[PDB]
């Protein structure tokens, strides 16, 4: 028999190290009625079991596999008809790329793959694009019709606040409940949950778990304080180098704070996870691995939020508002006798523009490249440095021994890519949702600086939707079966981002629409010696609090109206 | 047959105006197998129908009664055994009045009456008393062990904030769900819902209803502004009369602002309800009368909240903090040439003490008398002015014609009291919950002025629990049946009261613990010419906002911990 004729619907990758037990025969005698082909795997000590299970012999086989407890993973392989349907769906998606994705395509994808995670993520992405289209058109109208007075526009800020609140409420109470109900209709067997949640006694005292989660709040506060302190130090060093330094090579030295922060953040994150996040999440004793992963994501988002949004917050709330104070004798009050300018300290009136352009254009491309091209380049470099870098080889020898045909080799290579290739890993809902929410946070907090940010985000999200759909449908390891075999944190992050973005947008429009900085917002030769903002810090803070309360009330009203429907 | 031997389980009071329709005769023919005795009622055109229904002929009889649509009300009368059990329960409650009520008594009461409303209210009252006991003991310890400086104690304020948050979270997520589950277990047929929710087509577009509710927010804001403006005017007039007036009879005139406010508030409420609350609640087109009543209560609580808490808020945030401004030339800047003092304006350093004592002691007794003794005195006075005030006469004619025995007269009088007497009306969950929540608001916002307030509230609540239990079990009109025949707003009010009380307690301790007013809080001959508070208004407002956020976070943590359990 050949693998192509068998047309496997499932692949069992298991270790054959225990040749004394001879796992292969135990695996064969279990499948007394369903035919299978077992071939050596990518590793020396692993083998693939290509099987043709159906609705009938699914539950007993999977119960035996769970009892066997030496199976690495179970892959619900896509049959020929399913692969052809998915390829047709991908080709249809490729056509009309400029047009917004249609939700009937989402229905078809959810019907075919039966994957609640992928369908939920792509539903969020489709809703995001559909809502970004009018936002992009309004941003273009504000940018070009209003001409020079496009920064910190009151009209744009009101539209942005209303759009943020309505989009968040609509997703939370109109579209996400729809998709959760439709995907719980399937609620099909998930192989990743199996062989990871066995002997689920549970009774883990959910109250004690919640109490243990609260015990991490001091640790999160401490590490956030350390990171924020180092970010402030790096910002101060950058300002010192660029403005009040008189060195020969200030152009080269201006990259030093960037290197320092981009080196300190990974090391701090490594220490954070190794010594606090992992041990304390273990101590929480979560019943399920999904809950433990959610807890780790919640703990780790404190660092990601600060690393993402602290620079712009610093620029817009500490640097520009308080830059005239550094002009005074504070500089001379603050040891190596480096050459420093003795003239007045003038703030960079275009610092926020450049920073937001980087964080909304260049950073998006950088993250896209890191998540798409970087793993493949790393794998290619590893193979170039050492041909058989893991020294397992076994591939050409397996081809010679098995005499596999072209289609057999294609299926074997697909399974090997599932097991080893980074792009073949299981679809990660958390990572994609995190990246989308970071882009959303940038857009809803700082887009009043540049009304074209929604348009950039729309184009980026169209391309990202196409690429992610291709990857999840064609390369990602399948997780769900067509037949039964017997968001959470990011919603809270979205709500917090919406409230914070409304607050920050309104406050930034308040301070900077009619400020004294030339060329900032709407329309003295010594403007930099006085307060650039025409409102006292008391007014700014009170206005921020008032806008926070107003936004919370409006979101509550929207949530009530949509929940009633 | 006699009514005593029949031992009625329910009473049907219906109009006999349509003698041509002979409502008595068809009401009789429906009850072909269940024996009944029909006697003329309290009115000339009403009659009582004493029946002995059971679980068998319950649904058909009630469906026929609903189709009849000329029945005034159906009273699930208490039989002799149920009445004796309720009397035994009341007598047991009377014993050990000093001890806190036991929850097994609540279980027995809910088993007997099968009334979810009464059981829910009495569960809230019992939990309130049980939580008030440690609060009262701590308040006594602060009052006596610390001796002086018991006002605005930091220890007492911290305990009060923690107690408020924990009590609210515990009720919302531990005790109320428990009682809601127990009372939905019965979920027995309610006669008040019947003959009021007939032809329930519903499909009333809940979203449109929620939108119409939001349309009242401008009206509530406008009427709250009018009431607050008149309260400020009355407070200013009272301050003018008491302090900066030199009339012969200032003792008499000091009651003028009280009369003005106590006259304006009822008239404003009457106009409010007649022209805005009632028409707009009708326009909301609620499917059920319960929802309409809840909407009316929500609209009317805006006036009640202001009328209850504005005076103390004025005293503690406008009068004492800003009293040194009045003694300036503002008084001479502000037309009848009345005799006014030209000396310095000194704030009443004991105004808040007297006001809180009134609102926590005298006002409680006044409200108790209004809700218990006033209706009976009004009825007695009405009967004294006119013996037959409605010119009944026909009750005596019924007594003479029927020749009812002693027990028959007792049952007939009980039904008449149900229909006419104010204390015989159906148990009003809304009114009792509103009074309890008003007392709770006083206690959790202003008890830092007097740590003995929890003890006063505990004694008042013990007496109120006894009186309310006696009234609801012995005098109130029954609403629920023993057999099946086929909180909401106040939770939000409780949460808002808890958050506001935490904010106000912390802020009051912040301002007044170390103020310059002599004899206020912990320890100059011209102190009244300077700022009594040692913190600027900016600090006070920022501290209030910070405490609000901290309290919201703590309540969210408590709610999560209790919801997990």
Curated annotation (Swiss-Prot), chains A, B:
| Extracellular compartment spans | 141-151, 237-251, 322-439, 506-537
Which terms are listed as keywords in the entry?
A: Cell membrane, Membrane, Phosphoprotein, Transmembrane, Transmembrane helix
> Where in the cell is the protein located?
Cell membrane
Q: How does it sit in the membrane?
A: Multi-pass membrane protein
What spans does the record annotate as topological domain Cytoplasmic, numbered to this chain?
1-119, 173-215, 273-300, 461-486
**Major place of localization?**
membrane
Record keyword Cell wall biogenesis/degradation present: no
Q: Transmembrane segments in this chain: where?
A: 120-140, 152-172, 216-236, 252-272, 301-321, 440-460, 487-505, 538-558
Q: Which region is the signal sequence?
A: none
GO terms for MF: chloride channel activity; lipid binding
GO cellular component terms given for this protein: cell periphery; cellular bud membrane; cortical endoplasmic reticulum; plasma membrane
Q: Which biological process annotations from GO are given for this protein?
A: chloride transmembrane transport; endoplasmic reticulum membrane organization; protein localization to plasma membrane; regulation of phosphatidylinositol dephosphorylation
User: What does this chain do?
Assistant: May be involved in ion homeostasis together with BTN1 or BTN2.
Q: Quote the subunit structure annotation.
A: Interacts with BTN2.
- Protein name as annotated: Increased sodium tolerance protein 2
Please report the organism this UniProt entry assigns to the protein.
Saccharomyces cerevisiae (strain ATCC 204508 / S288c) (Baker's yeast)
Give the organism's phylogenetic lineage.
Eukaryota, Fungi, Dikarya, Ascomycota, Saccharomycotina
